[PDB]
Amino acid sequence: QKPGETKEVHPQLTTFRCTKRGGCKPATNFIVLDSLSHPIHRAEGLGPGGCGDWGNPPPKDVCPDVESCAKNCIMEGIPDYSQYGVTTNGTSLRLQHILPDGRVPSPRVYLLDKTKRRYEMLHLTGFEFTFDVDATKLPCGMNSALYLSEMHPTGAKSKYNPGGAYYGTGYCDAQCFVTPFINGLGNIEGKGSCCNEMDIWEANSRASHVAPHTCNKKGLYLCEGEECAFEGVCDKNGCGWNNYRVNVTDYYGRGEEFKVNTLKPFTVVTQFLANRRGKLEKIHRFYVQDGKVIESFYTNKEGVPYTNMIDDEFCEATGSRKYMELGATQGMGEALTRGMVLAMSIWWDQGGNMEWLDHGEAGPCAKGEGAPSNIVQVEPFPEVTYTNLRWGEIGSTYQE
Ligand SMILES: *[C@@H]1O[C@H](CO)[C@@H](O)[C@H](O)[C@H]1NC(C)=O
Ligand SMILES: *[C@@H]1O[C@H](CO)[C@@H](O)[C@H](O)[C@H]1NC(C)=O
């Protein structure tokens, strides 16, 4: 959609690039909300209305084709990100799910480079990504996410998408969702927005999930028909890594009887371990809390390969069929090597209550506990804070 006249004021976020020899050196980044989270309205001199909701093509009246859509639908800048529950403070990003005044912005943001006109492209195969988190205000059924998508570096800036990454265009993920704009262009044919997606962190105070998701396409792929479905071009489920799913129940939770005590802050380390040829083989997750390294659990479950890392053997074993079929750990590594955009969000699940994250085989949460009607009784204002985003050499990102 065409940029409007309102000023876009991106929050500044200091991050780090890490080496063994040089330590953690600070870098300037900016934060941008998803393009379709910006106010989108019909152009000056057109009757008021919308340019499409999540799940829909754009409207036939103002968007019969890409060129009409590009002039009739206006994306306004957001001059005050706090109205959408997005604030930064030095090296800290705070995402508020619900504001004090009752609004539910459920924000999703991307990391821009210091120009504000191109995503920071992370190339993590053979490297580590680390962050500090406060998960205390995330009950059952909340998802705090920190992940990568294979979005176009400029948000697919183009003649009819002049806004680009500066307005957060070009979002995609392994769900192949229909959005009224894809690559900042009217999705006239109502296709899905597919790409490789690496879920570094999907967690609340009750459960922690890591999951790579493969697609058999490079970059953002516009899917039609069966391509968007479970047997299509992307892996919707991913290869899930969660202590609970591998029958380890005392690793992560609220209080001193868990190794990672989600009542206090902690650090999350993710290593992308490659072979001599630069192909990804293992994803290693471990934590640091109160100045001490908490090594990963080993799997503890009959029929599951005994491992402390994600790899092809574990993924095949645990039923991740589309993950293996659409490129497996090597394919995921190739997307990570091409470069990905960092996305950070907070959301809840009216339909499923996020049961796949923290319920049953995945955690300690009862049926219905994760329903939004119950979340607000446990925590009226859910929020997450990510602090000191930092990536670089294996073993360089953490102290003690
Ligand atoms: C920034 O964070 C620190 C907590 O470290 C707090 O002292 C400070 O008041 C915060 N700044 C703003 C503007 O909220
Ligand atoms: C699950 O965990 C406990 C180990 O504490 C063990 O008794 C049980 O056999 C394990 N179950 C499976 C299905 O591996």
Residue numbers in the entry: 1 to 400
Task: Please give sentences taken from the publication describing this entry.
Though often considered synonymous with cellulases, β-1,4-glucanases are enzymes which recognize β-1,4-linked glucan chains which are characteristic of both the cellulosic and hemicellulosic (i.e. mixed-linkage glucans, xyloglucans, and glucomannans) fractions of plant biomass. The catalytic actions of a variety of retaining β-1,4-glucanases contribute to the breakdown of lignocellulosic polysaccharides. As a tool for the rapid detection and identification of β-1,4-glucanases, a series of glycosylated cyclophellitol inhibitors mimicking β-1,4-glucan oligosaccharides have been synthesised.
Cyclophellitol is an inhibitor of β-d-glucosidases originally isolated from the Phellinus mushroom. This cyclitol is an isostere of a glucoside where the acetal group is replaced by an epoxide. Taking advantage of the catalytic machinery of a retaining glycoside hydrolase, this epoxide undergoes an acid-catalysed ring opening addition to form a non-hydrolysable ester in place of the normal glycosyl-enzyme intermediate, irreversibly inactivating the enzyme. Compound 1 proved to be an efficient covalent inhibitor of HiCel7B, with a ki/KI of 450 M−1 s−1. Intact MS confirmed complete, single labelling after 60 minutes at 25 °C. Binding of the inhibitor had no significant impact on the structure of the active site, inducing no conformational change following addition to the catalytic nucleophile. This is in spite of the epoxide oxygen forming an extremely close (2.3 Å) contact with the general acid/base. Extending beyond the −2 subsite, in which essential hydrophobic stacking with W347 and hydrogen bonding interactions with R108, Y147, and S345 are formed, the active site broadens significantly, suggesting a lack of a specific −3 subsite, possibly accounting for the weak selectivity between 5 and 13.
